[PDB]
Amino acid sequence: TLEYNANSKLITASDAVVALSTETNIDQINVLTTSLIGETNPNFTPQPNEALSKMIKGLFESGMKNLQQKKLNEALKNVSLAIEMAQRKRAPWEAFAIQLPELHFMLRSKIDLCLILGKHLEALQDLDFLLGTGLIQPDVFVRKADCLLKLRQWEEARATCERGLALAPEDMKLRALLIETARNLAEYNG
Amino acid sequence: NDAHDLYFQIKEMSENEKIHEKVLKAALLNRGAESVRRSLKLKELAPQINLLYKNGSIGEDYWKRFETEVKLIELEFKDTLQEAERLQPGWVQLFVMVCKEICFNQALSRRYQSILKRKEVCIKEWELKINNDGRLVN
Amino acid sequence: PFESFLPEVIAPERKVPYNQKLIWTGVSLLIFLILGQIPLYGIVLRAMLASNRGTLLELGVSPIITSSMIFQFLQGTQLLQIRPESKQDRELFQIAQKVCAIILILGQALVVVMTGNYGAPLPICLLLIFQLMFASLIVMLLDELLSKGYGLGSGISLFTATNIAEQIFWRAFAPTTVNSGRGKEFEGAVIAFFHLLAVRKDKKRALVEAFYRTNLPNMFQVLMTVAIFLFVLYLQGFRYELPIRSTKVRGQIGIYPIKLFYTSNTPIMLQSALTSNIFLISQILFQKYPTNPLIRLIGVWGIQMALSGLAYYIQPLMSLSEALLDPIKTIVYITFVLGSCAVFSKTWIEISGTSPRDIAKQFKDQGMVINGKRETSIYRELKKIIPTAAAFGGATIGALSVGSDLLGTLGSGASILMATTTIYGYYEAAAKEGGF
Amino acid sequence: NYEYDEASETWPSFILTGLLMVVGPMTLLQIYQFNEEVFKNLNEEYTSDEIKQFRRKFNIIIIVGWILVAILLQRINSNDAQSTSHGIALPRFLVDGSASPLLVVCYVALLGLILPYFVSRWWARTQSYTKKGIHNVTASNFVSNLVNYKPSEIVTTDLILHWLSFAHEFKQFFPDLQPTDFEKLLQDHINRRDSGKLNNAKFRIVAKCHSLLHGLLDIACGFRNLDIALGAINTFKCIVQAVPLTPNCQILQLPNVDKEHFITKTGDIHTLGKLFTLEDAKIGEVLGIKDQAKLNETLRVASHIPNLKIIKADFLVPGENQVTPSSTPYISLKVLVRSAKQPLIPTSLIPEENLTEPQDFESQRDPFAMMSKQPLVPYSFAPFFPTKRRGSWCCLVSSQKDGKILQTPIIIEKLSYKNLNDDKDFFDKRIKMDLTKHEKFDINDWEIGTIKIPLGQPAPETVGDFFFRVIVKSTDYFTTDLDITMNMKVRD
Amino acid sequence: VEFVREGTQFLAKCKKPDLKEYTKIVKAVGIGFIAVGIIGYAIKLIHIPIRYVIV
Amino acid sequence: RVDPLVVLFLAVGFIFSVVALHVISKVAGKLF
């Protein structure tokens, strides 16, 4: 079953245990309802909003400003808040070809900052998402193999370097990464 | 495992408890997005199933079942679109593109949400010793 | 062209494995063999054990064979104008097969039941018609089933090979006896051998008495037919393998086998049909007119073997005694049958579209070439291979038939050759495809 | 009309001949009637009794024919004995006595009941199984599992065990248990735990999992999915060796070690080469067993499992010298089965004779005949698997532009393990004295195996370099596998 | 006599079967021949007393 | 349109029907 709130207009399943599909569908319906309550015009167009994009850009600029001032802690926080706001306060029916590249452009800077700071697992997961969602470039496999070497996974690092060289065989950093991976693996087996 | 019956449940709840009007539109858009997603999935999976069947590795009844589901999805989409016409006057030309976009948007949203759970499985599998601030302590 | 909704077995959507194929073949064969041993209902030694006369298999496969040959002749004479570019005229020809076969079955059943010896006096006649119609339709459906893909091959060839093997085995292991004055003697070879060896208690005499047996089958014929079977099996593996390579998609290398038995049992069949027809014609002509110069010249029939006639000159030799009796008849008959087989094989390869020119055309179409030779010489290379193969295959088939009829085997060389070819086809297909 | 045997004077001879033609050949045929396996003895010394008992639990016709022949011959010899009169050999009471309706009723029964029922049973039984060897419901479940598979969910061993626990072939064995019980039994097997009462069912389903995992791998390669295929191979390894997947597993698959000591004491030994780097007694002191008669067995097991290594790999087309557009090439690998104890032999020392392909028509018409002539792989050392298995290597090829498996996996079974024998024990890693310049080292004694994989798809019609990825994994041990990339230079 | 010479020249270049292949050939073909012959003979023999009793 | 089992059943049914007709006629002639 499922109960319907009155003042918040949010649907919640009052059952003891629920499946995962039911829960994610109820969450999607809640998101769509919270968007429709806010958007006024009944015949809404897939055209993106303006004030939300302005706020997101302002937050991302305030986060990028701290790099020039050499504060690598609050810059990452501001970038994370910008990404969270972009993923939270944006209606689902907005243009996908405009909603995806902004996420890519902010996630790239977040990845660079997390890699420079010292966090490697978060950066590795961000690289994996960014590569599985449709972005394959030689500037991705370099960083992915870097993380996989920093947290000591040598077979995956070698496979990543090989797949990176199978796309841009003229690269000068993937070759050094492959040399280092081969050395570490030969010390690992011998 | 679908969002088809959840809209009907919300509809029967509205017929009794006088819920708002936009919840119906939300459930309808969700059902339309799911129908579009399933149609694209079947359109992309058809050749591999055909090859598995021709090679003799899937059976004889599953092929008929797949061919039946192919048109069951179209019937469901037509019913959803008729209901969209019934719910709002002149909302059939834009409903399709709205669903076409919310499908991709919510798929991307789920893919991005899954990384928090994806991050701990690798810790458990590789036996990492991660302290606070995400650094390694060997 | 027209619309027809006739019962037909649908082909499997996927390739059937070998075990199911073998089991379906065996089951269909068992059904066909059981169907031909049950007599009709209303009809009024055995007199029905030798031939399938008086059973539900009266017509048998005869209407199917007649429809096949008449439509094959109509296709060969180029009056249908078939074009393989369409996938509808083929189905039209296939349904023409059946619409001719069914009406031929109806006509033949009517003629047999209204003229045959079953009896002129309505319900009994209707039942006798329905039995034959249902049996022939069952046989046709079973052949179609075996041909659609559920069986190892065609149905007619399997049925003929089964009949041949059954006759060969019944001539040797027949439990029936014959009592003519002296006593009861088994009509088999091995059965009578063991019987005369056990009960007579005179082994030295019983061996010669059961080994020759001028009046009934004996053991010498069994040994001779086993030897001829082994030799025929040996001459089936002969093949000329010339190397070919592809030019469209490089990396496709193989061989093209050119067998020795290139015509594969056809010229001997043509020769046998011609000889039977001319012998029957001469016999009927001698029956009609007692004495005439030309009729006395062609053949003088007497006690039925004609004497001092051309039919006598072309009459086959049953044993070595007749051969030694008149050397001229042998030295004419051997050369006649060998030359006829060779000429028939050559004409058949020239007619049936298997001439070296057509093979060269197929090679040019597929894009293949010969390994160590050029492109403009495939025809000149096939001309030096295929005609000699066909001629010598025909000559060898004729010589095998002559030797088999001379040594006095349990079955003629033509029937053993047909059965061996039919079974070797299944064996070669199973080996090439791969199956248990 | 026929005349049936009235005085029993003809049918004895017929039955005697019928019996002889069957007895003679059978008696005649009764009168007429490459790879060293080192683990065949050491496997039966470590298998527990509960598995031995399970594997244990789960000519008279000639003599009777000769006695019947003797009886028939005695009866024949004991007997007393113009137009033609035909007769039959069968006795008279069979057709004219009181047993006349019995013959026809038995005929009608055997024709109408036994034939159609048995034929229908055989047809319904053969129409239910898949060409691969698994049920139709199991294949349907596997396809339905891979259809709605969220790509965000990461594949593990627990996921594939959960998928396996829904096989229909597990229900025919024990129609009382539930899929949760099957998953619990599989977890108990992998974690080396005791079930108490369902051991005879655990062993059964664990021995059955072989065909199920092979079919799942086939279907996953058919759907062009690499992660699920790799997970299936790893799960097969874990099921065979009875060990959960961890980083230091090549050293935990050994027969007699204690994890509570090795894990907590050492933390840098993860492979077998790193283990054989240490001395002879240091290995025992690290693994914590301190028993020489018991240390020699584990050292004989650890130095006899095969590791691979490439010598030369390229795309070859039969009858040409290069790859051209729309041609049909294949893959040619020259591997070297080595032990974890031997040092590396340089590729330059190979005399180049074993690496070249013969150029002859009989050799280039079918390039797999030379591969099909190698000896089989010996029996593996798996004391916890119920049945007895042979080794195997599952090789699958994928692409590098997108990362999708593009053909079903080839499974090789013939390979030569000559380099693992005990006569080449001088070639040890701890001597560090450049053992290539040794008195016993002859580079013509080391065997170089070959692996040929048909590509199944022709070369692209364009011109350029196209990269692939070949993976050759084992299915029994946790050894060193192959993972190489190679490109075909379509040059026209 | 030239025809026999060409025939022998063709027979020379042919590919005769060896012992290992001829054994498989004779085994398979003999098995098939016996399998069809025994079935035909048994069906022909069984139906004599049945056809006596029934008809 | 028609399956192999249908053909087998048709054949066995026709054969058994003919045999049953024979034996029924024989028994009827023997009794009366």
Q: What is the largest CA-CA distance in chain A?
A: 69
- Cβ C150 vs Cβ C11: under 8 Å: no
Name every chain E residue with its beta carbon within 8 A of the beta carbon of C34.
43
| Phi and psi, residue C306, nearest 5° | -75, 155
Considering only CA atoms, which of D476, D429, D482, D435 is closest in space to residue D303? D429
For F18, which of C24, C56, C150 is closest by C-beta distance? C56
What is the distance between the alpha carbons of residues F18 and C131, in angstroms, rounded to a whole number?
9
Minimal C-alpha gap between E8 and chain D (Å):
25
Considering only CA atoms, which of A61, A101, A55 is closest in space to residue A79? A61
What lies within 8 Å, CB to CB, of A86 at 6+ separation is A56, A102, A103, A106
Considering only CA atoms, which of A134, A145, A132, A151 is closest in space to residue A175? A145
- Cβ C279 vs Cβ C258: under 8 Å: no
**DSSP single-letter state for residue B136:** B
Return the amino acid letter for B7: Y
Name every chain F residue with its beta carbon within 8 A of the beta carbon of E54.
19, 22-23, 26
Helix axes D100-109, E19-54, angle to 10 degrees: 130
Q: Is F6 on the interface with D (CB under 8 A)?
A: no
What is the distance between the alpha carbons of residues C207 and C224, in angstroms, rounded to a whole number?
17
Chain B residue whose CA is closest to C17: B56
Number of neighbouring beta carbons within 10 Å of residue C291: 8
For E7, which of C26, C233, C388 is closest by C-beta distance? C388
Chains with 3 or more CB pairs under 8 A to chain C:
B, D, E, F
Minimal C-alpha gap between A118 and chain B (Å):
6
Cβ–Cβ gap A163/D483 under 8 Å: no
Q: Is F16 on the interface with C (CB under 8 A)?
A: no
> What is the number of CB-based contacts under 8 A between chain B and chain C?
5
- Cβ C222 vs Cβ C190: under 8 Å: yes
What is the distance between the alpha carbons of residues D227 and C188, in angstroms, rounded to a whole number?
71
Resolution (A): 3.1
What is the distance between the alpha carbons of residues A157 and A152, in angstroms, rounded to a whole number?
9
Cβ–Cβ gap D115/F12 under 8 Å: yes
- Cβ E43 vs Cβ C33: under 8 Å: yes
What is the distance between the alpha carbons of residues A122 and A112, in angstroms, rounded to a whole number?
11
- Cβ C386 vs Cβ C359: under 8 Å: yes
Cβ–Cβ gap B51/D222 under 8 Å: yes
Cβ–Cβ gap E53/D88 under 8 Å: no
Cβ–Cβ gap F12/D108 under 8 Å: no
Q: How far is CA A149 from CA A128, A156, A157, B131, in A?
A: 15, 9, 6, 19
Return the amino acid letter for C200: R
- What are the residue ranges spanned by the domains of chain C? 18-172+223-433
Own/partner contacts of A170-176, CB < 8 Å, gap of 24 or more, are A171/A138, A171/A142, A173/A142, A174/A138, A174/A141, A174/A142, A174/A145
- Cβ C33 vs Cβ E36: under 8 Å: no
Minimal C-alpha gap between E37 and chain F (Å):
22
What lies within 8 Å, CB to CB, of C341 at 6+ separation is C267, C268, C271, C394, C395, C397, C398
**D136-245 maps to which CATH number?**
1.10.3380
Question: Could you say which of 2.102.10.10, 3.40.50.720, 2.60.40.150, 3.90.950.20 is the CATH number of the domain covering D310-490?
Answer: 2.60.40.150
Q: What residues does C242 pair with on adjacent strands?
A: C256
Cβ–Cβ gap B59/D136 under 8 Å: yes
Minimal C-alpha gap between C68 and chain F (Å):
23
Q: Do chains D and F touch (3 or more CB pairs under 8 A)?
A: yes
Minimal C-alpha gap between F29 and chain D (Å):
16
Could you tell me which residues of chain E have a Cβ less than 8 Å from any Cβ in chain C?
3, 6-7, 10-11, 13-17, 21-22, 25-26, 28-29, 32-33, 36-41, 43-45, 47-48, 51, 55
> What is the number of CB-based contacts under 8 A between chain C and chain D?
95
What is the distance between the alpha carbons of residues D425 and D419, in angstroms, rounded to a whole number?
10
Q: What is the largest CA-CA distance in chain D?
A: 110
Cβ–Cβ gap F5/D104 under 8 Å: no
Cβ–Cβ gap C8/F2 under 8 Å: yes
Q: Do chains E and C touch (3 or more CB pairs under 8 A)?
A: yes
Considering only CA atoms, which of D291, D325, D269 is closest in space to residue D459? D325
Name every chain D residue with its beta carbon within 8 A of the beta carbon of B121.
154, 156
Cβ–Cβ gap C138/F18 under 8 Å: no
- Cβ B24 vs Cβ B10: under 8 Å: yes
Experimentally, the structure was elucidated by: cryo-EM
Cβ–Cβ gap D361/C253 under 8 Å: yes
- Number of DSSP helices (H) and strands (E) in chain F, helices first: 1, 0
Cβ–Cβ gap D90/E52 under 8 Å: no
Chains with 3 or more CB pairs under 8 A to chain E:
C, D, F
Name every chain F residue with its beta carbon within 8 A of the beta carbon of D111.
12, 15-16
Residues in chain B: 138
Chain A residue whose CA is closest to B109: A87
Cβ–Cβ gap C237/E17 under 8 Å: yes
Considering only CA atoms, which of D265, D270, D277 is closest in space to residue A188? D270
Cβ–Cβ gap A26/B6 under 8 Å: yes
Q: Which two tokens stand for residue E50?
A: 């049945």
Encode chain D in three state secondary structure: CCCCECCCCCHHHHHHHHHHHHHHHHHHHHHHCCCCCCHHHHCCCCCCHHHHHHHHHCCHHHHHHHHHHHHHHHHHHCCCCCCCEEECCCECHHHHCCCHHHHHHHHHHHHHHHHHHHHHHHHHHHCCECCCCCEHHHHHHHHHHHHCCCCCCCCCHHHHHHHHCCCCHHHHHCCCCCHHHHHHHHHHHHCCCCCCCCHHHHHHHHHHHHHHHHHHHHHHHHCCCHHHHHHHHHHHHHHHHCCCCCCCCCCCCCCCCCHHHHHHHCCCCCCCHHHHCCCHHHHHHHHCCCCHHHHHHHHHHHCCCCECCEEEEEEECCCCCCCCCCCCCEEEEEECCECCCCCCCCHHHCCCCCCCCCCCHHHHCCCCCCHHHCCECCECCCCCCCCCCECCEEEEEEECCCCCECCCCEEECECCCHHHCCCCCCCCCCCCCCHHHCCCCCCCCCCCEEEEEECCCCCCCCCEEEEEEEEEEECCCCCCCEEEEEEEEECC
What is the distance between the alpha carbons of residues A121 and A132, in angstroms, rounded to a whole number?
16
What is the distance between the alpha carbons of residues D137 and C302, in angstroms, rounded to a whole number?
76
Q: Is E50 on the interface with D (CB under 8 A)?
A: yes
Cβ–Cβ gap D104/E53 under 8 Å: yes
Own/partner contacts of C63-68, CB < 8 Å, gap of 24 or more, are C63/C101, C63/C104, C63/C105, C63/C108, C63/C136, C64/C101, C64/C139, C64/C140, C64/C143, C64/C156, C65/C156, C66/C104, C67/C97, C67/C100, C67/C101, C67/C104, C68/C97
Minimal C-alpha gap between A166 and chain D (Å):
6
Q: Is the dihedral of CA D25, D31, D32, D35 positive or negative?
A: positive
* 3-state SS, residue C59: coil
Q: Within its chain, how far is the Cα of D128 from the centroid?
A: 23
Residues in chain A: 190
What is the distance between the alpha carbons of residues C63 and C100, in angstroms, rounded to a whole number?
9
What is the distance between the alpha carbons of residues C424 and C236, in angstroms, rounded to a whole number?
8
Alpha helices (H) along C56-202:
62-76, 89-115, 123-145, 156-170, 190-199
Helix axes C266-288, C327-351, angle to 10 degrees: 120
Minimal C-alpha gap between C259 and chain D (Å):
20
Q: Which residue segment(s) compose the domain that B60 sits in?
A: 1-138
Q: Which two tokens stand for residue D466?
A: 């196209």
Q: Is E43 on the interface with F (CB under 8 A)?
A: no
Q: Is F14 on the interface with D (CB under 8 A)?
A: no
Own/partner contacts of C75-82, CB < 8 Å, gap of 24 or more, are C76/C351
CB interface of A with B, residues 129-148, below 8 Å = 129, 132-133
- Cβ D225 vs Cβ D403: under 8 Å: no
What lies within 8 Å, CB to CB, of D382 at 6+ separation is D43, D240, D241, D242, D389, D476
Number of neighbouring beta carbons within 10 Å of residue D449: 21
- Cβ C393 vs Cβ C405: under 8 Å: no
Q: Which residue segment(s) compose the domain that A120 sits in?
A: 1-190
What is the distance between the alpha carbons of residues C261 and C238, in angstroms, rounded to a whole number?
8
Chain F residue whose CA is closest to E55: F22
Q: Is F31 on the interface with D (CB under 8 A)?
A: no
Chain C residue whose CA is closest to B52: C14
Minimal C-alpha gap between C80 and chain B (Å):
35
Q: Do chains B and F touch (3 or more CB pairs under 8 A)?
A: no
Cβ–Cβ gap D143/B49 under 8 Å: yes
Chain F residue whose CA is closest to D109: F16
What is the distance between the alpha carbons of residues D89 and D335, in angstroms, rounded to a whole number?
71
- Cβ D100 vs Cβ E53: under 8 Å: yes
